[PDB]
Amino acid sequence: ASRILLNNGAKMPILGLGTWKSPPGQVTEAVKVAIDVGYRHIDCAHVYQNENEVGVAIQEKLREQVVKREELFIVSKLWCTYHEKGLVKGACQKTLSDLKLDYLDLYLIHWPTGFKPGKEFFPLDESGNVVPSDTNILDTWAAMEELVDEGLVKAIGISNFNHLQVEMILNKPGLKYKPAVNQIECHPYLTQEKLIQYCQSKGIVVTAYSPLGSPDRPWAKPEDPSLLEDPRIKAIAAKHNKTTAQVLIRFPMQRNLVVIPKSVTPERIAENFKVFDFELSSQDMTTLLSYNRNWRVCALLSCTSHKDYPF
Numbered sequence: 160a161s162r163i164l165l166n167n168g169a170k171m172p173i174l175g176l177g178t179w180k181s182p183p184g185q186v187t188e189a190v191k192v193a194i195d196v197g198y199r200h201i202d203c204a205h206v207y208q209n210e211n212e213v214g215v216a217i218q219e220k221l222r223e224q225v226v227k228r229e230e231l232f233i234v235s236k237l238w239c240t241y242h243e244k245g246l247v248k249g250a251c252q253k254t255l256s257d258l259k260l261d262y263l264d265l266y267l268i269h270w271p272t273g274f275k276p277g278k279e280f281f282p283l284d285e286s287g288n289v290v291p292s293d294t295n296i297l298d299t300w301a302a303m304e305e306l307v308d309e310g311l312v313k314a315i316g317i318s319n320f321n322h323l324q325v326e327m328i329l330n331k332p333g334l335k336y337k338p339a340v341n342q343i344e345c346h347p348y349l350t351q352e353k354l355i356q357y358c359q360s361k362g363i364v365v366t367a368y369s370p371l372g373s374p375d376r377p378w379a380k381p382e383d384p385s386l387l388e389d390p391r392i393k394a395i396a397a398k399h400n401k402t403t404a405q406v407l408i409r410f411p412m413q414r415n416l417v418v419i420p421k422s423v424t425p426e427r428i429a430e431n432f433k434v435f436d437f438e439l440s441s442q443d444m445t446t447l448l449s450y451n452r453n454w455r456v457c458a459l460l461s462c463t464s465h466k467d468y469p470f
């Protein structure tokens with residue numbers, strides 16, 4: 160089954176194309192190729208600085224009538240410097256204009272932390288600590304709810320929310336819409352059993368990011384573990400006559416997760432989509448889960464300061 164039902168009643172494709180680090184000079188063709196070979200979900204964000212180019216691709220494949228708007232599932236995220244009530248609508252509208260869309264299928268609070276508004280995405284103090292905003296997640300959530308009620312977004316959700324923060328939203332006084340999705344880091348080195356079971360038990364669909372361990376993350380270090388090069392994962396792939404990436408993408412799909420591998424390489428974009436015709440065994444799944452080491456791609460010292468830093 161290629162889509163999962165969300166608690167807003169809409170279906171979300173379980174495979175999407177990620178776009179963080181996709182160069183603006185390459186991402187338009189990457190998205191065009193992706194849609195040509197089957198992808199119907201694109202994961203975006205304003206902070207990635209490439210939504211205009213992603214939007215050129217979506218608009219061209221709409222204009223060519225390759226796909227209909229209803230068949231696409233486009234996701235973006237509210238950056239930290241826009242948590243303020245009077246900045247959320249405009250942030251969403253900027254993303255809409257850049258993506259050439261009149262609505263988003265899903266809009267996420269990108270991180271639970273609000274930062275000081277301004278030109279800078281990471282406003283720092285002179286000692287390098289992020290400068291917080293006094294906004295809290297519950298008031299930010301109410302602002303997200305407004306976007307649903309104005310027709311700018313079909314679904315709202317959260318990203319990098321820990322258990323307690325998910326719970327805070329669900330327990331919000333006067334909660335109007337539950338989050339549809341929690342998008343978090345998840346792969347065999349960070350298997351997330353606790354947060355996923357919690358989210359799923361509440362009917363929140365979990366999207367796994369960095370499913371390949373983000374080998375192109377700008378802060379990678381030599382000593383870091385490498386999923387794609389792990390011989391134990393390579394051996395499961397070889398057994399199935401698939402690539403290691405293919406196994407890493409199928410893994411979350413069998414846990415009822417949505418997964419969003421990024422590539423700008425046409426051959427890999429296509430390879431990564433060829434994951435609906437094979438199954439990992441229960442033993443394969445448990446074996447992959449055994450590799451957990453609580454290793455995170457996405458953590459940031461400058462922000463650990465903040466009252467709502469999630470890890």
Ligand SMILES: NC(=O)c1ccc[n+]([C@@H]2O[C@H](COP(=O)([O-])OP(=O)(O)OC[C@H]3O[C@@H](n4cnc5c(N)ncnc54)[C@H](OP(=O)(O)O)[C@@H]3O)[C@@H](O)[C@H]2O)c1
Binds near residue numbers: 371430456
């Ligand atoms: N919500 C958040 O806070 C958050 C955080 C991180 C990521 N995300 C989203 O999740 C997406 C995916 O995560 P990510 O970009 O961190 O990393 P990823 O998808 O785990 O890994 C991307 C890297 O893997 C390479 N790659 C892709 N397919 C491959 C294949 N078949 N074989 C070998 N290498 C392959 C890509 O190379 P090429 O591109 O050169 O082919 C790129 O270097 C992001 O792009 C973003 O949309 C969200």
Ligand SMILES: O=C(O)COc1cc(Cl)ccc1C(=O)NCc1ccc(Br)cc1F
Binds near residue numbers: 207271272457459468
């Ligand atoms: O956050 C993403 O989606 C991917 O990571 C980044 C993307 C870009 Cl364009 C810039 C920087 C990051 C980035 O540094 N992400 C890590 C991060 C960020 C904020 C917080 Br509150 C915590 C944290 F771990």
